């Protein structure tokens, strides 16, 4: 009894070999700025945790984005602030410009640099084959950089990818769920968004790593190339695994929970059944075939695997033939 331990194939000990204050976010002292520098213009969007507004910095007349954080555990607030600052400057990562507070109620707000307010669920169904390749590569730059800096995003989905299509500019946003990787650590399986949850979360396996993000990136790519959104459309967390199992096959799933000796939740017993590994060509049809190539299908297949350890790392993914034509244009 008891689960087999796991560890990341890359950047396993980047946090071990850094000063505590890098990853000990509970101890981070927040340096507050002047709230009266920022005035609101319009609401951009909302979430469970936050309310988001476009605003103007009256000192220099520039547009900003203010993510107002609803009451949560101070712990969670510091975690996001530390991560945003550790990754600040990095490729395709959102730039945190300032942190402010309502001196009376003490509601904290994050101030980011302006991003053109079009996420991915917005045009990523009218993009060309090269466009999908191009933007997928840009997500991998951020995913490789934040992994290399010892951080897993834990909520990769289209709502969290901001695209200025006019300027071919991409930003990976919302790090309120991101967490530091420490080998051996048992993490919370309650992360992401149902449709982007990795198998490891759905079976309650806690010793996951950066690979979780690669599953989610798989779910995105499948959605974009096959033109089905979301790709795995589960009604609850248990059903979510049944949807995945209908595509990947139940054989590799029972192999997976054996390799890692994971005690399944009793309410999976009679629900999963027996399903074959389906061929990726099955989801191809006339509306989507212009986006589906053999390189796309090989790449997808190497991302969407039950075994987190067999999934491509973000750096490995970047090496795939699917991006050869992008990497060629990029060197210019």
């Amino acid at each position: 009894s008891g689960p087999v331990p796991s560890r990341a194939r890359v950047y396993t000990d980047v946090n071990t070999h850094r000063p505590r204050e890098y990853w000990d976010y509970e101890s981070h002292v927040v340096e507050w700025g002047n709230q009266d520098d920022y005035q609101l213009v319009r609401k951009l969007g909302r979430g469970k945790y936050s309310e988001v507004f476009e605003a103007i910095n009256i000192t220099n007349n520039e547009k900003v984005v203010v993510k107002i954080l609803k009451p949560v555990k101070k712990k969670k607030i510091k975690r996001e602030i530390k991560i945003l600052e550790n990754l600040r400057g990095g490729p395709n990562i959102i730039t945190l410009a300032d942190i402010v507070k309502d001196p009376v109620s003490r509601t904290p707000a994050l101030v980011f640099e302006h991003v053109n307010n079009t996420d991915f669920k917005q045009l990523y169904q009218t993009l060309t084959d090269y466009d999908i390749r191009f933007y997928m590569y840009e997500i991998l730059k951020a995913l490789d950089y934040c992994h290399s800096m010892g951080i897993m995003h834990r909520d990769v989905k289209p709502h969290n990818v901001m695209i200025d299509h006019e300027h071919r500019k991409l930003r990976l946003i919302d790090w309120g769920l991101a967490e530091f990787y420490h080998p051996g650590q048992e993490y919370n399986v309650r992360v992401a968004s149902r449709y982007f949850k990795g198998p490891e979360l759905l079976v309650d396996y806690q010793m996951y790593d950066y690979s979780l993000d690669m599953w989610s990136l798989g779910c995105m790519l499948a959605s974009m190339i096959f033109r089905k959104e979301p790709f795995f459309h589960g009604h609850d967390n248990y059903d979510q695994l049944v949807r995945i199992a209908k595509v990947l096959g139940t054989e590799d799933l029972y192999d997976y929970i054996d390799k890692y000796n994971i005690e399944l939740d009793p309410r999976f017993n009679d629900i999963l059944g027996r399903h074959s590994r389906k061929r990726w060509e099955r989801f191809v049809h006339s509306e989507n075939q212009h986006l589906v190539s053999p390189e796309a299908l090989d790449f997808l297949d190497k991302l969407l695997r039950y075994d987190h350890q067999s999934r491509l790392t973000a750096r490995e993914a970047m090496e795939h033939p699917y991006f050869y034509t992008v990497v060629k244009d990029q060197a210019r």
């Binding site: 709230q35 507004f53 402010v100 009376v104 109620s105 509601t107 707000a109």
Partner: protein, 195 residues
């Protein structure tokens, strides 16, 4: 009981002061009013508690109430009128400014028109210098022309000492501590224009 004293005593007539008999008995003060009220001669008689001689008695009563109103509007522009109204203002008989930042500044009655029929009595706050509708509904039937467009303005022309300071503080809209930029009202009014 004097008719003037009765009328000014009625519910709704809280804004009126009691006009002096001297003022009415001097024909020169009522110049031109005979061309504005029906039954002028009899109306004046009722106001002055003089010997009268049906529904006709109620028709005279209306005219008396209209004439009294129009006399009032001239009377309160005079030094004595102002003196009396000023006394009522010091007691707050006219109500107080609903504007939070006016801090309950006592108000004065004003007419938006000098012609009878066009508008009911409104209240003028001397701090924010704006005009309001009376909160109490009993005052939604008193004609504005019985106070006139120039009463409060004359009052402060005559007693400038009584003009209050401009409000020290202003309302500042904040959302979660953030002020709202002016470019937000322009965008808000644009969207409302497109519907």
């Amino acid at each position: 009981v004097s008719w003037i004293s009765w009328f000014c005593g009625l519910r709704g007539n809280e804004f009126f002061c009691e006009v002096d008999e001297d003022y009415i008995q001097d024909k020169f003060n009522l110049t031109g009013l005979n061309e504005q009220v029906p039954h002028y001669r009899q109306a004046l008689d009722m106001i002055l508690d003089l010997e009268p001689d049906p529904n006709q008695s109620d028709l005279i009563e209306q005219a008396a109430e209209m004439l009294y109103g129009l006399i009032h509007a001239r009377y309160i522009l005079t030094n004595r009128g102002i003196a009396q109204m000023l006394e009522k203002y010091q007691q707050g008989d006219f109500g107080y400014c609903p504007r939070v930042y006016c801090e309950n500044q006592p108000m004065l009655p004003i007419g938006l028109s000098d012609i009878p029929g066009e508008a009911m009595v409104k209240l003028y706050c001397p701090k924010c210098m704006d005009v309001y509708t009376p909160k109490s509904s009993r005052h939604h039937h008193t004609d504005g022309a019985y106070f006139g467009t120039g009463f409060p303005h004359m009052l402060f022309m005559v007693h400038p000492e009584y003009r209050p300071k401009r409000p020290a503080n202003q309302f500042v809209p904040r959302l979660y501590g953030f002020k709202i930029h002016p470019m937000a009202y322009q965008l808000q009014l644009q969207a409302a224009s497109n519907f």
